[PDB]
């Protein structure tokens, strides 16, 4: 479809292009406006308003465009490069590398942004745990293969730190790739800091950055770009999924994807729905998070970060996000103030895979009893702070001691990210977490003071440090 | 030869054979409808989006009122009038200037109050300049930036110790009604007297009297030697208020990329304050609704998160490859009854790196900077602090968090045990320490010394209502009896192990000498 | 729709000169309506606004010269 | 340095001033000549320029 | 008569009139519709719709109009008389005298309604305190010369009475004139109860009415009249400002101005903003307020009443005016029902001019200490509600007594309040009130009971009453 | 003061102003047929 049209209307980041009566571009067909030299503006067709007129979102500056400019139809949605050539590179919404390196090249396979999800036959009937290395994540709210996990928290609780240490864990300890979709990524927070963090984490002769793809829909971009960056990262990850690999896509803020969709719908003149949101919120979430599944060939596990507006979990954006979630990891500022870097609240982190018949019979006894002990501590904390531990009877003093031990034991140094409290790499497996927490839950740790459990290992590091200090 | 011969040699080239006397069919537009600051033009097909149009002078009007061609609809150009809408009439000629909006930039704008178009309004003569920078440009990008390391010293102990602001960091100041947001911004501007940083103040949608008072405050403290005051007041059209912060940040990006000679030193660091982004968003909402663009939540247009983001993502910290300069943004947001979850507040909060929350409850309770430490964050953190402040303010942050956990027991402290009463008294003394008078910023050495005195057990003897006075007196002591202690603290403020025995012993001796010779 | 011609003379144009202006400007659409203005700021020549197109004759050269010299 | 820059600015201002004077007086003598010579030549030339 | 057109549409108070294409009226022009009674209907243009059609706000009944009526354009905006001829008269939005006196002659100067505000370089930053006759206004929230000051309260708290009392006080005890803008003025508050209350003799034969100008944009007027009455009063006051005189402007209500703007915008078919309000709310408020400034030549100093429904200060009407204020007087119904008829709350009544560098150190010290003791009493009254004052007090008895005495001493009998009470009015200079509060603050009033502070002038009046009782 | 000497520098108006005006009026904006005299008095009176 080499059809050439002309720009008819320009209203903000929403343009209209008049084409011939035949060969009109389809919906999501990525028209392109040359701007001189090699620069071009890639718009995405959203509506067909009659005789050859298509309404599209700019996905670019569109601040120097005149009416009547030539527009080239591409005949397909936005084409982004896929393959090993995308590893170690940073892309915008259009798949153009926004790092210092040059273009990808014409010999690299390009794929459309808008694909269909895996069919009904391709879905995996039986779920499977995804080991991630983190103690609290693998124990309390375990991941699922081809599933969605959402991390919550405040502005500075450490969600991005958790995301990047998970990227490092996936890249270094196992030979697996990951794709990071920085939707609404600040040009300071992610466009240099995350690159430095990924290029600082090194295993041998290569970095964690070398085993991950990055697609940055920065905040300065128009709402269409921040809307389509998630699908761009999905397209770049589905290649490795088609090779049978287990990709773990990360999403910087799925709420900013929702807000980009709402802004795009408002700019197109559509009637608002719910709390001023787009009418197509459910379908827009489905077209993204139904491509994150466990195919019979390969799998895409995903980890989103969700911003909850006004701490309202019944808000339509968290309501629609929660419909697709398989696990939740709640970060609390209170835990962060106690110098706990993995500030995961085990009493607020859930997972659908936490079942006796999937993650193990001992898993859904150790996790259940750990949660019960922590709930007992949460109940008794006010009494302890007001009165003191002397009022607590037996079976409650021991419970509080074990609860403090596990609460301080959930902390990890994230030695892969920088070298803060650096120590030999552990990457504690799921079975090791189960065995350590069953060990402490069955006593065997009461002689340890409640200060050794800090950035520790697998409860064998705890006893090793106890023997080293004084034994 | 004479220099006038060189002057004539410059002439007699364009004078004789340098002018093209060719008449050409230039495409102009005719006005078909004038609204409430929006004029629609029939045919102007040689116009780009956001291009400044002229409206050339006509009978009874000896000046041209420019506009901004925003809606390039099919056979229609809706342009928002920058000046006054009364003079524009149906059938008026409109000539496309062929240019996007640009503002004069450079050394000449230093101490000048200017329009968003760059025209001076201070009445101090024309702006001297040789370069114009475009209003709208893309942010520096991905590889251009650098991690924020250099601190911006606002002079407020609470901000500089708990909510660090670094060069290249977008730190929102969000408050409500009269809580001192402009006071905090002006205090930050006044503290850059010799810090090698050029300040810019935008003042979108304010009073002419308020901007005049701000300029008078700046020029009575000598701050206009390095400050640029853009001004789009309340009476001015919504187009000027819409383009004011972009003009300010264009000047700031000129400072960042090239730099200016300030005090004989090249300065490439700029601190910009958008004193009302809520008013800027209101002005752009008026522009969009008068253009009949489809509204969204709270009647704001769809591209209102985009609006501010273009403005705020231009504040960067460039690496040494791209000059090493920086632009620091201090947006100001006014909430309504502390409605943090409103549209524009959430937009700016998500965009900006950190937030500074000002509460009316603290303002009316005597807290002179009405800063809410509990909810306000700076995600850059310790990287935007000196090593001295990093070493000292950690215990201050911990003690203040402990006090905020126990704030309900403050009036009951006489009936509690020893440790809880001690924590409450320490928190009360620290909160009284953070109270600062207006227009009195403190240097980093003074803040470090005061916070070291407070962090260690030295303010326990002096009662709470005198803590502030103690601080003032101590500073006077350090300003008169021991300048060497202040110089020593300032000299090794970048040392990784800041409390070296030399500076530690000097500071302890100064504190003991002050306490022994003073009574409270 | 009889586009409004906006001819502005240098200082003044004669009745036969005005008739010649009308006899020449009819080539744009039909015999469209022409309005003649004085505009004494113009030194010589005259400015013709046929619809949405303008063809200035003189005076503009002065501005073109001064923007070339200044 | 400021005095040198002010001298340069004054020289540029003098150049702009003589440019304004020569343009204005050329316009005045052109008005005088169009008082002498008829306007019909320029009118016909502009009409042919359409 | 530059142009004559015909009425095309009459929709309520909106008139669409077709004019010749070369003689279309300007944006803020006034167009007169001659009626069959010797009078005319003056509409204000607001928009230019297409080819020669203009939309105008009626500023009249439009119950006698038919389509095709002749409409004469005036060429310029609404022209209102200025000068001494307007002094002592009552006008409307059109500048026509609505009192029983004769029409204004054609020899007077008539100025357009819409004028640009003074430029930035004309602003006089020198803050000067304007002497009001009110004790609490002088002490707590001093009146700024050339600044804009507001009164906030519910219904019946005393805003209009306070405004007319300042008119009487500053016209009697001072030579300052006054201009009154009855925006949305009730026909009981404006047609009576202010005309009669301005029949207060100044010296021998001149009343306050003879030295004041009144412009009543009454409530039964269409929304355009109530929208432009404030600008009419501003135009009338700007003549006295331009003569070098320090003029006083009282806008009797601000939220009615906002309501008129909202109604005008809704009637014109503009897109609604915020909660159904006008999109040009901030611009209209700025256009009104920015003309009230202190210049080198003269100074318009204004007091504007604002009615907050319930306690909602976040409504668009008080929120859009907060940016334009130099001082706020918060009236409370609780204080009014306690027979303290000047029901100013000393707390939550701020002022930018309350600075020791402007009003002096003694004024600042007295005001700050009075606010401190009242703040202490705000808790001590609760404390003594259950535990009697005689039971226990560590200097609490003395500070409670002083605070009760000063909160009664803030009450002042008004000249215009003789109808309500019968007590003759009192005027206190700004020096005398701060001196009296300084004297009462530290002793010298502890023996006089809290009955002689009720309705008095300075402290000398309280004393004279005390030793008049003890005879 | 040394900068404000431009005036003394500008007492050489005869070499520049007359020639530039003549070549501007004739050689660039018309067909160089400025034979009609009488404008010399105007340029002498007006350039001072
Ligand atoms: N640290 C302080 N100590 C004492 N007074 C202060 C302090 N900061 C501000 N003020 C006082 O409070 C007033 C209000 O502060 P300011 O004008 O900065 O607030 P704002 O949030 O910008 O308000 P506005 O909505 O009026 O623009 C100041 O004019 C000043 O008198
Ligand atoms: N100074 C005063 N003395 C006595 N009564 C007063 C005084 N001020 C107000 N009032 C009471 O308030 C009423 C007038 O209130 P008004 O000012 O019209 O209300 P608003 O403040 O809503 O305009 C009167 O009926 C009167 O009883
Ligand atoms: Mg402010
Ligand atoms: Mg009233």
HEC string of chain A equals: CCCEEEEEEEECCEEEEECCCCCCCCCCCCCEEECCCCCEEECEEEEECCCCEEEEECCCCCCCCECCCEEECCCCCCEEECCHHHCCCEECCCCCECCCCCCCCCCCCEEECCCCCCCCCCECCCCCEECCCCHHHHHCCCEECCCEEEECCCCCCCHHHHHHHHHHHHHHCCCCCEEEEEEEECCCCCCCHHHHHHHHCECCCCECHHHEEEEEEECCCCHHHHHHHHHHHHHHHHHHHHCCCEEEEEECCHHHHHHHHHHHHHHCCCCCECCCECCCHHHHHHHHHCCCCEECCCEEEEEEECCCHHHCCCCHHHHHHHCCCCEEECECHHHHHCCCCCCECCCCCCECCCCCCCCCCCHHHHHHHHHHHHHHHHHHHHHHHHCCCCCCCCCCHHHHHHHHHHHHHCCCCCCCCCCCCCCCCCCCCHHHHHHHHHHHHCCCCCCCCCCCCCCCCCCHHHHHHHHHHCC
C45–chain D nearest CA distance, Å:
5
Measured from the CA of E355, which atom of ligand 1 is nearest?
Answer: 31
What tokens does E366 get? 């007295």
Q: What are phi and psi of A144, to 5 degrees?
A: -125, 145
Q: How far apart are CA E292 and CA B362, in angstroms?
A: 32
What tokens does A342 get? 């993995």
Q: Which of A314, A311, A354 is nearest to A333 (CA)?
A: A311
- Cβ of E322 below 6 Å from ligand 2: no
Residue-wise DSSP of B185-240: HHHHHHTTSSSS-EEEE--BT--HHHHHHHHHHHHHTTGGGSEEEE-B-SSS-HHH
Q: How far apart are CA E214 and CA E200, in angstroms?
A: 16
Query: Which residues does chain B have within 8 Å of residue F11's beta carbon, measured at their own beta carbons?
Result: none
Q: Which ligand is nearest to the CA of B370?
A: 1
What tokens does B68 get? 């901004």
Q: Ligand 1 atom 16: the closest Cα is on which residue?
A: B180
**Mutation test of the interface with chain D: which of C66, C67, C68, choosing the one with the most D Cβ atoms within 10 A?**
C66
Measured from the CA of E343, which atom of ligand 2 is nearest?
Answer: 8
Number of C-alpha atoms within 13 angstroms, CB side, residue A340?
Answer: 22
Check residue E2 and report its DSSP letter.
-
> What is the experimental method?
cryo-EM
Query: Which residues does chain F have within 8 Å of residue C58's beta carbon, measured at their own beta carbons?
Result: 29
E301 annotated as belonging to a binding site for a ligand: no
Cross-chain Cβ contact F28/B7 below 8 Å: no
The three-class DSSP label of residue B6 is helix
Greatest extent of chain C over all pairs of C-alpha atoms, in Å:
43
Cross-chain Cβ contact C52/B20 below 8 Å: no
Helix count (H) and strand count (E) of chain F? 3, 0
Query: Which residues does chain C have within 8 Å of residue D46's beta carbon, measured at their own beta carbons?
Result: 45-46, 48, 55, 57-58
Ligand 3 is an ion; its neighbours by CB within 5 Å are B 182
Q: How far apart are CA B273 and CA C54, in angstroms?
A: 44
- DSSP run (H or E) holding B405: helix B387-405
Helices (H), ranges, E314-458: 316-319, 333-337, 356-359, 361-386, 396-409, 430-441
Measured between CB atoms, does B35 come within 8 Å of chain E? yes
Q: Ligand 2 atom 19: the closest Cα is on which residue?
A: E156
Q: How far apart are CA B24 and CA B4, in angstroms?
A: 36
Angle separating helix axes F39-46 and D2-36, nearest 10 degrees = 150
- The number of residues in chain B equals 520
Ligand 1 center from residue B509 Cα (angstroms): 38
Number of C-alpha atoms within 13 angstroms, CB side, residue A79?
Answer: 13
Q: How far apart are CA B498 and CA B506, in angstroms?
A: 13
Cross-chain Cβ contact B3/F9 below 8 Å: yes
Question: From edge to edge, which strands make up the β-sheet containing A246-251?
Answer: A90-91, A212-218, A178-185, A246-251, A299-305, A148-151, A327-329
**Mutation test of the interface with chain D: which of F1, F5, F39, F46, choosing the one with the most D Cβ atoms within 10 A?**
F39
Q: Which residue has the tokens 């803590």?
A: B467
E-strand stretches of E103-173: 109-112, 129-130, 143-144, 148-153
Please work out, in degrees rounded to the nearest 5, the angle formed at the alpha carbon of residue B118 by the alpha carbons of B116 and B124.
120
Q: Which residue has the tokens 């990457």?
A: A427
**DSSP bridge pairs for C37:** C8
Q: Which of B379, B400, B504 is nearest to B448 (CA)?
A: B504
Q: How far apart are CA B102 and CA B246, in angstroms?
A: 10
- DSSP run (H or E) holding B160: helix B157-162
- Cβ of E41 below 6 Å from ligand 2: no
What tokens does E257 get? 């101005």
Do the chains E and D touch each other, judged by at least 3 C-beta pairs below 8 angstroms?
no
Residues whose CB is less than 8 angstroms from the CB of residue A436 and which lie 6 or more positions away in sequence, other chains included? A135, A409, A428, A458, A459, A460
Residue-wise DSSP of E292-352: S-BBSS-EEEEEEEEEPSTT---SHHHHTTGGG-SEEEEB-HHHHHTT-SS-B-STT--BT
b/e map of E215-227 (b: 16 or more CB within 10 Å)? Answer: bbbbbebbbbbbb
Q: How far apart are CA E17 and CA E45, in angstroms?
A: 10
Please work out, in degrees rounded to the nearest 5, the angle formed at the alpha carbon of residue A349 by the alpha carbons of A346 and A353.
115
Measured between CB atoms, does F23 come within 8 Å of chain B? yes
What tokens does B151 get? 């601190």
What tokens does A192 get? 């240099």
Is A173 among the catalytic positions? no
Could you give the dihedral angle defined by the CA atoms of residues E307, E313, E319 and E323, in that order, rounded to the nearest 10 degrees?
90
Q: How far apart are CA E178 and CA B146, in angstroms?
A: 61
Q: Which of E445, E363, E365, E382 is nearest to E409 (CA)?
A: E445
Residues whose CB is less than 8 angstroms from the CB of residue B497 and which lie 6 or more positions away in sequence, other chains included? B391
- The number of residues in chain E equals 471
Q: Yes or no: say if E136 and E331 are a contact pair by the CB < 8 Å rule.
A: no
Please state, in angstroms and as integers, the Cα–Cα distance from residue A81 to each residue in A41, A217, A368, E20, E28, following that order.
18, 16, 45, 62, 58
Q: Yes or no: say if B8 and F15 are a contact pair by the CB < 8 Å rule.
A: yes
Q: Which residue has the tokens 């287990």?
A: A246
Helices (H), ranges, E140-254: 159-172, 223-242
Contact partners for chain E, using 3 or more CB pairs closer than 8 A, are B
Ligand 2 center from residue A126 Cα (angstroms): 77
Neighbours of A271 (CB within 10 A): 9
Cα first-last separation, chain F: 22
The three-class DSSP label of residue E277 is strand
Q: How far apart are CA B267 and CA C37, in angstroms?
A: 55
Q: Yes or no: say if B283 and B82 are a contact pair by the CB < 8 Å rule.
A: no
- Cβ of E157 below 6 Å from ligand 2: yes
Structure's resolution in angstroms = 2.9
In this structure, are strands E299-307 and E148-153 parallel, antiparallel, or unpaired? Answer: parallel
- Cβ of E161 below 6 Å from ligand 2: yes
Q: Ligand 1 atom 4: the closest Cα is on which residue?
A: B368
What tokens does E373 get? 């003791």
Burial class from Cβ neighbours inside 10 Å (0-12, 13-18, 19+) for residue E347 reads: middle
Burial class from Cβ neighbours inside 10 Å (0-12, 13-18, 19+) for residue E91 reads: buried
Number of C-alpha atoms within 13 angstroms, CB side, residue E410?
Answer: 28
Measured between CB atoms, does B402 come within 8 Å of chain A? no
Q: How far apart are CA B427 and CA B436, in angstroms?
A: 16
Neighbours of B100 (CB within 10 A): 17
Cross-chain Cβ contact D49/B7 below 8 Å: no
In this structure, are strands E178-185 and E79-82 parallel, antiparallel, or unpaired? Answer: unpaired
Burial class from Cβ neighbours inside 10 Å (0-12, 13-18, 19+) for residue C2 reads: exposed
Q: How far apart are CA D22 and CA D30, in angstroms?
A: 12
What tokens does B263 get? 């005090």
The three-class DSSP label of residue E373 is helix
The three-state (H, E, C) secondary structure of B43-93, written as one string: CCCCCECCEEECCCCECCECCCCCEEEEEEECCEEEEEECCCCCCCCCCCE
Ligand 4 center from residue E253 Cα (angstroms): 7
The three-class DSSP label of residue E276 is coil
Q: Yes or no: say if E217 and E181 are a contact pair by the CB < 8 Å rule.
A: yes
Q: Which of B155, B201, B233, B202 is nearest to B440 (CA)?
A: B155
Query: Which residues does chain D have within 8 Å of residue B23's beta carbon, measured at their own beta carbons?
Result: 46, 49
Across the B:E interface, residue pairs with CB atoms under 8 Å apart total: 134
Residues whose CB is less than 8 angstroms from the CB of residue E287 and which lie 6 or more positions away in sequence, other chains included? B235, E117, E231
- Ligand 1 pocket test, pick from B172, B182, B189, B367 with the greatest ligand atom count within 8 Å of Cβ, gives B182
What tokens does A380 get? 């008794």
Q: Yes or no: say if E77 and E71 are a contact pair by the CB < 8 Å rule.
A: no
Q: Which of B128, B106, B271 is nearest to B199 (CA)?
A: B271
Q: Yes or no: say if B35 and B290 are a contact pair by the CB < 8 Å rule.
A: yes
Q: Yes or no: say if A237 and A229 are a contact pair by the CB < 8 Å rule.
A: no
Secondary structure percentages of chain D, helix, strand, coil, to 5: 90, 0, 10
Q: Yes or no: say if B40 and B29 are a contact pair by the CB < 8 Å rule.
A: no
- DSSP run (H or E) holding E250: strand E246-251
Cα first-last separation, chain B: 79
- DSSP run (H or E) holding B475: helix B467-480
Number of C-alpha atoms within 13 angstroms, CB side, residue B223?
Answer: 25
Is A159 among the catalytic positions? yes
Residues whose CB is less than 8 angstroms from the CB of residue E128 and which lie 6 or more positions away in sequence, other chains included? E144, E145, E146, E358
Greatest extent of chain D over all pairs of C-alpha atoms, in Å:
56
Measured between CB atoms, does B12 come within 8 Å of chain D? no
Q: How far apart are CA A181 and CA A250, in angstroms?
A: 6
Q: Which of B363, B355, B268 is nearest to B316 (CA)?
A: B268
Measured between CB atoms, does B7 come within 8 Å of chain D? yes
Check residue E440 and report its DSSP letter.
H
Residues whose CB is less than 8 angstroms from the CB of residue E447 and which lie 6 or more positions away in sequence, other chains included? none
Q: How far apart are CA E173 and CA A267, in angstroms?
A: 60
Neighbours of B390 (CB within 10 A): 19
Cross-chain Cβ contact C62/F28 below 8 Å: no
- The number of residues in chain D equals 50
Q: Yes or no: say if F23 and D23 are a contact pair by the CB < 8 Å rule.
A: no
Chain F residue with the nearest C-alpha to that of D45 = F30
Q: How far is CA E238 from the centre of its chain?
A: 16
Q: What are phi and psi of A264, to 5 degrees?
A: -65, -45
Neighbours of B102 (CB within 10 A): 17
Q: Yes or no: say if E178 and E233 are a contact pair by the CB < 8 Å rule.
A: no
b/e map of F18-37 (b: 16 or more CB within 10 Å)? Answer: bbbbbbbbbebbbeeebeee
Query: Which residues does chain B have within 8 Å of residue D15's beta carbon, measured at their own beta carbons?
Result: 7, 10
Point out the residues of E that are catalytic. Answer: 159, 185-186
Measured from the CA of B185, which atom of ligand 1 is nearest?
Answer: 18
């Amino acid at each position: 479809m080499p059809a050439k049209g002309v720009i008819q209307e320009i209203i903000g980041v929403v343009i209209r292009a008049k084409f011939p009566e035949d060969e009109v571009p389809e919906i999501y067909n990525a028209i392109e406006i040359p701007l001189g030299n090699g620069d071009r503006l890639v718009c995405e067709v959203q509506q067909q308003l009659g005789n050859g007129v298509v309404k599209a979102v700019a996905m670019g500056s569109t601040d120097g465009l005149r009416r009547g400019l030539e527009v080239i139809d591409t005949g397909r949605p936005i084409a982004v490069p896929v393959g090993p050539a995308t590893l170690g590179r940073v892309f915008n919404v259009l798949g153009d590398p926004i790092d210092g390196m040059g273009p990808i090249g014409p010999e690299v396979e390009r794929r459309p942004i808008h694909r269909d999800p895996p069919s009904f036959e391709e879905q995996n009937t039986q779920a499977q745990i995804f080991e991630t290395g983190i103690k609290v994540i693998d124990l309390i709210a375990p991941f699922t293969r081809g599933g969605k996990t959402a991390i919550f928290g405040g502005a500075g609780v450490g969600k991005t730190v958790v995301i990047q240490e998970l990227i490092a864990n996936i890249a270094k300890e196992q030979s697996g790739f990951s794709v990071f979709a920085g939707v609404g990524e600040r040009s300071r927070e992610g466009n240099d800091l995350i690159h430095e963090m990924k290029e600082a984490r090194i295993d041998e002769n290569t970095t964690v950055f070398d085993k991950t793809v990055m697609v940055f829909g920065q905040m300065n971009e128009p709402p269409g770009a921040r809307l389509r960056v998630g699908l761009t990262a999905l397209t770049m990850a589905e290649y490795f999924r088609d090779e049978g690999r287990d990709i773990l896509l990360f999403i910087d803020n799925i709420f900013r994807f929702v807000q980009a969709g709402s802004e795009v719908s408002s700019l197109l003149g559509r009637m608002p729905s719910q709390v001023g949101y787009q009418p197509t919120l459910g379908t827009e979430m489905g077209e993204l998070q139904e491509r994150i599944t466990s195919t019979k060939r390969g799998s895409i596990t995903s980890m989103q970060a969700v911003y909850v507006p006004a701490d309202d979990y019944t808000d339509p954006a968290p309501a629609t996000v929660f419909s697709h979630l398989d696990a939740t990891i709640s970060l609390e500022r209170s835990i962060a103030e106690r110098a706990i870097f993995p500030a995961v609240d085990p009493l607020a982190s859930t997972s659908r895979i936490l079942d006796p018949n999937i993650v193990g019979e001992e898993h859904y006894r150790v996790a259940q009893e750990v949660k019960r002990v922590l709930q007992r501590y949460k109940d008794l904390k006010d009494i302890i702070a007001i009165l003191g531990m002397e009022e607590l009877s037996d079976e409650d003093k021991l419970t509080v001691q074990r609860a403090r031990k596990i609460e301080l034991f959930f902390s990890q140094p994230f030695t892969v990210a920088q070298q803060f409290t650096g120590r030999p790499g552990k990457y504690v497996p799921v079975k090791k977490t189960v065995e350590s927490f069953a060990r402490l839950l069955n006593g065997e740790g009461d002689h340890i003071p409640e200060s050794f459990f800090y950035m520790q290992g697998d409860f064998d590091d705890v006893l090793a440090a106890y023997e080293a200090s004084q034994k | 030869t004479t220099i006038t011969e060189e002057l004539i040699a410059r002439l007699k080239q364009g004078i004789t054979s340098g002018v093209d006397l060719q008449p050409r069919q230039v495409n102009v537009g005719t006005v078909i409808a004038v609204g409430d600051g929006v004029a629609r033009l029939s045919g102007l097909d040689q116009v780009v989006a956001s291009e400044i149009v002229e409206f050339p002078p006509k009978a009874g009007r000896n000046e041209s009122i420019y506009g901004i061609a925003l809606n390039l609809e099919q056979d229609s150009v809706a342009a928002i009038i920058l000046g006054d809408d009364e003079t524009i009439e149906e059938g008026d000629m409109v000539t496309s200037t062929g240019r996007v909006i640009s503002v004069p930039v450079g050394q000449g704008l230093l101490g000048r109050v200017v329009n968003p178009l760059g025209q001076p309004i201070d009445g101090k003569g024309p702006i001297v300049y040789e370069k114009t920078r475009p209003i709208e440009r893309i942010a520096p990008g991905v590889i251009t930036r650098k991690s924020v390391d250099t601190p911006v010293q606002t002079g407020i102990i609470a901000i500089d110790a708990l909510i660090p602001i670094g060069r290249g960091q977008r730190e929102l100041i969000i408050g409500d009604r009269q809580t001192g947001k402009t006071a905090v911004a002006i205090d930050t501007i006044l503290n850059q007297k010799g810090q090698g940083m050029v300040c810019i103040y935008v003042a979108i949608g304010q009073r002419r009297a308020q901007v005049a008072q701000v300029v008078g405050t700046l020029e009575r403290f000598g701050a206009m030697e390095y400050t640029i005051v853009v001004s789009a007041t309340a009476s001015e059209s919504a187009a000027l208020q819409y383009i004011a912060p972009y003009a300010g940040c264009a000047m700031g990006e000129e400072i960042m990329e090239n730099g200016v000679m300030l005090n004989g030193q090249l300065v490439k660091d700029a601190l910009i304050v958008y004193d009302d982004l809520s008013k800027h968003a209101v002005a752009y909402r008026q522009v969009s609704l008068l253009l009949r663009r489809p509204p969204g939540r709270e009647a704001y247009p769809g591209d209102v998160f985009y609006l501010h983001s273009r403005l705020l993502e231009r504040a960067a910290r460039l690496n040494e490859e791209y000059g090493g300069g920086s632009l620091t943004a201090l947006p100001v947001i006014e909430t309504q009854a502390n409605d943090v979850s409103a549209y524009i507040p959430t937009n700016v909060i998500s965009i900006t790196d950190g937030q500074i929350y000002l509460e009316s409850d603290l303002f009316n309770a005597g807290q002179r900077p009405a800063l809410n430490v509990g909810i306000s964050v700076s995600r850059v953190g310790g990287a935007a602090q000196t090593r001295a402040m990093r070493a000292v303010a950690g215990k201050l942050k911990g003690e203040l968090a402990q006090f905020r956990d126990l704030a309900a027991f403050a009036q009951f402290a006489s009936d509690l045990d020893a440790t809880t009463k001690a924590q409450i008294e320490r928190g009360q003394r620290l909160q009284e320490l953070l109270k600062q008078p207006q227009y009195q910023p403190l240097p980093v050495e003074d803040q470090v010394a005061v916070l070291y005195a407070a962090t260690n057990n030295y303010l326990d003897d002096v009662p709470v209502p005198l803590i502030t006075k103690w601080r003032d007196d101590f500073l006077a002591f350090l300003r008169t009896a021991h300048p060497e202690v202040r110089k020593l603290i300032y000299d090794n403020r970048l040392d990784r192990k800041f409390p070296t025995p030399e500076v530690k012993e000097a500071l302890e001796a100064a504190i003991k000498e002050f306490k022994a010779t003073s009574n409270y | 729709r009889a586009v409004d011609a906006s001819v502005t003379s240098a200082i003044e144009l004669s009745a036969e000169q005005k008739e010649r202006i009308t006899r020449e400007l009819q080539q744009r659409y039909g015999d469209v309506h022409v309005t003649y203005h004085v505009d004494p700021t113009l030194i010589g020549g005259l400015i013709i606004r046929v619809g949405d197109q303008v063809l200035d004759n003189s005076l503009r050269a002065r501005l073109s010269a001064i923007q070339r010299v200044l | 340095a400021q005095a040198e820059q002010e001298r340069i600015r004054m020289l540029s201002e003098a150049k702009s001033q003589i440019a304004d004077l020569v343009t204005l007086t050329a316009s005045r003598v052109l008005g005088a000549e169009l008082q002498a010579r008829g306007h019909d030549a320029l009118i016909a030339e502009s009409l042919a320029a359409l």
